[PDB]
Design a protein around this ligand. Structure first.
Ligand SMILES: NC(=[NH2+])c1ccc2nc[nH]c2c1
Ligand SMILES: [Ca+2]
Ligand SMILES: [Cl-]
Ligand SMILES: [Zn+2]
Ligand SMILES: [Zn+2]
Length: 223
């Protein structure tokens, strides 16, 4: 995350780290046995780490559980990143506590203007590379579809929204992919893509989760 701050211990308790020997993507816990992340984070052999703050230090608050299965959306397009969502089922149920909580799915979509919290362990340097080890947070608003589409012409679909600041400065970045965008206590977005990180006129693009709630609910119930 660039221009964000250190969240702190368990302030984003639904945050997950996807690990395949190292941390490669983020995710959101939606109930004791399921995690939603981005389809471009699919890898085989995923281990989910819950209650993580520093991904390089075990502080006795974690739960390391392997995935039993992954489901990438039927319409995921890896070229356009349209429908970039995937579900990961956990082998055993995580134990929910103060440090590990699930986030709720929305009943409606959020409006431009709404303030969201974006979190993750991705790069922190726009012009450079720095990978933090503690969780970073960023409060950003949903931008208007017009400001989003003028920034990426012919590339935004109804399944994507933009959030951030056009002045550049703060934004999601490499690593943070798969992570949550929570607005008014609901999981409304998933970090999906952007043009570099925090550049002027280049906000991040997020999967608009409100368009997949019936697919999520149906898929989890039959798997
Ligand atoms: N600028 C962004 N918000 C962004 C987020 C995730 C990415 N994954 C590759 N590039 C990315 C860029
Ligand atoms: Ca740790
Ligand atoms: Cl992350
Ligand atoms: Zn990350
Ligand atoms: Zn990515």
């Amino acid at each position: 995350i660039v221009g964000g701050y250190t969240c702190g211990a368990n302030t984003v308790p639904y945050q997950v780290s996807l690990n395949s020997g190292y941390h490669f993507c983020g995710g959101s816990l939606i109930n004791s046995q399921w995690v939603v992340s981005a389809a471009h984070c699919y890898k085989s052999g995923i281990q989910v780490r819950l209650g993580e703050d520093n991904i390089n230090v075990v502080e006795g608050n974690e739960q390391f559980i392997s995935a039993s299965k992954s489901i990438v959306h039927p319409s995921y397009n890896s070229n356009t990143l349209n429908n970039d969502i995937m579900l990961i089922k956990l082998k055993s149920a995580a134990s929910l506590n103060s440090r590990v909580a699930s986030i709720s799915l929305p009943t409606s979509c959020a409006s431009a203007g709404t303030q969201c919290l974006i979190s993750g362990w991705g790069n922190t340097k726009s012009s450079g590379t720095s990978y933090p080890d503690v969780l970073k947070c960023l409060k950003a608003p949903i931008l208007s579809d017009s400001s989003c589409k003028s920034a990426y012409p012919g590339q935004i679909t109804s399944n994507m929204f933009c959030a951030g600041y056009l002045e550049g400065g703060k934004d999601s970045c490499q690593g943070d992919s798969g992570g949550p965008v929570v607005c008014s206590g609901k999981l409304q977005g998933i970090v999906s893509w952007g043009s570099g990180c925090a550049q002027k006129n280049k906000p991040g693009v997020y999967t608009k989760v409100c368009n997949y709630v019936s697919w999520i609910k149906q898929t989890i119930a039959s798997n």
